[PDB]
UniProtKB/Swiss-Prot annotation:
The gene is RPL21. This is Large ribosomal subunit protein bL21c. Belongs to the bacterial ribosomal protein bL21 family. Component of the chloroplast large ribosomal subunit (LSU). Mature 70S chloroplast ribosomes of higher plants consist of a small (30S) and a large (50S) subunit. The 30S small subunit contains 1 molecule of ribosomal RNA (16S rRNA) and 24 different proteins. The 50S large subunit contains 3 rRNA molecules (23S, 5S and 4.5S rRNA) and 33 different proteins. Transmembrane segments: none annotated. It is found in: Plastid, Chloroplast. Component of the chloroplast ribosome (chloro-ribosome), a dedicated translation machinery responsible for the synthesis of chloroplast genome-encoded proteins, including proteins of the transcription and translation machinery and components of the photosynthetic apparatus. It comes from the Eukaryota.
Amino acid sequence: NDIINQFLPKKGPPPPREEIFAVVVIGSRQYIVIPGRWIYTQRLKGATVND
RNA sequence: UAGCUCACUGAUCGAGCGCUCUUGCGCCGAAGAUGAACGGGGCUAAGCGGUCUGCCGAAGCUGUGGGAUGUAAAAAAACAU
Ligand SMILES: [Mg+2]
Ligand SMILES: [Mg+2]
Ligand SMILES: [Mg+2]
Ligand SMILES: [Mg+2]
Ligand SMILES: [Mg+2]
Ligand SMILES: [Mg+2]
Ligand SMILES: [Mg+2]
Ligand SMILES: [Mg+2]
Ligand SMILES: [Mg+2]
Ligand SMILES: [Mg+2]
Ligand SMILES: [Mg+2]
Ligand SMILES: [Mg+2]
């Protein structure tokens, strides 16, 4: 069972997130955002990586 | 010739009715050659007028980002394109 666990792993349990979602306006489009997830948008002018 | 019948009149019946226009929408006039042939299915509105209010609808206008050309002679920032 150590071998058969190594080579055929069981699906791990899902990471915890809050049960919540929002609908937010960015660059005049509306996205549904759930926390922990990344989305694509219009360039935000004057935004730097790690902001 | 006769004969039938009409115009007109008396009577009966008891509440409307005559001849005129004129709008709107229809009917007939209207019939071809490969096969519904007029978008289709269908609809008495899901057709036609008139009025009220919602919505859909484009590469138009707005929103958020990039480019370029002209001002213009470095940029950057404007405006226009
Ligand atoms: Mg006769
Ligand atoms: Mg025929
Ligand atoms: Mg039709
Ligand atoms: Mg109408
Ligand atoms: Mg459009
Ligand atoms: Mg285009
Ligand atoms: Mg375009
Ligand atoms: Mg335009
Ligand atoms: Mg622009
Ligand atoms: Mg330029
Ligand atoms: Mg220029
Ligand atoms: Mg120049």
